[PDB]
Amino acid sequence: GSSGSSGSVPKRQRIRKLQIRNIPPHLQWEVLDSLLVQYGVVESCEQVNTDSETAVVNVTYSSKDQARQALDKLNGFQLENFTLKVAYIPDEMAAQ
Numbered sequence: 001g002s003s004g005s006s007g008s009v010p011k012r013q014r015i016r017k018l019q020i021r022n023i024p025p026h027l028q029w030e031v032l033d034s035l036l037v038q039y040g041v042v043e044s045c046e047q048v049n050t051d052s053e054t055a056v057v058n059v060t061y062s063s064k065d066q067a068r069q070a071l072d073k074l075n076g077f078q079l080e081n082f083t084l085k086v087a088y089i090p091d092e093m094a095a096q
Contacts, residue, residue, distance in 0.1 A: 014064070015060065015091060015092075016060075016061070016064055016067050016088065016089070016091075017046075017058050017059070017060050017089040017091075018058065018059040018060070018061070018067055018070065018071055018086055018087070018088060018089060019048065019056070019058055019059075019086065019087050019088075019089045020056065020057050020058070020059060020074055020084060020085070020086050021050055021052065021054060021056045021084070021085045021086075022054045022082050022083055022084050022085040023054045023055035023056065023057070023079070023082065023084060024054065024055070024079055024080035024081075024082040025053065025054065025055055026080055027079065027080060032045075032057070033045065035074075035077075036059055036070065039061075039066060039067075039069050039070035039073070039074075040061050040062070040063060040065075040066025040067065040069065040070060041061060041062045041063065041066060042059055042060065042061055042062075043060045043061060043062045044060045045057060045058070045059055045060070046058040046060065054082060058089065070086070071086040071087075071088070074086045075087075
């Protein structure tokens with residue numbers, strides 16, 4: 001878009017949030033974190049509830065490449081007999 005902005009622009013861009021499900025309620029959080037960062041630089045790890053037994057959380061990496069791997073693996077990373085499922089989360093648009 002044209003250049004018509006003066007000030008400190010926000011940082012709500014490049015948000016390829018990732019959704020992870022099929023997580024074992026036995027594993028310890030302290031463990032999950034490591035698994036995340038291990039892939040790349042997780043900007044933030046938000047919580048989510050898909051109304052399912054297994055635990056669900058949303059991963060937000062800084063770079064796209066880093067995120068690609070995380071999912072590329074987690075998407076099917078078997079953990080405690082629980083095939084972790086990962087899917088690219090859609091961005092927030094000003095439309096239905």
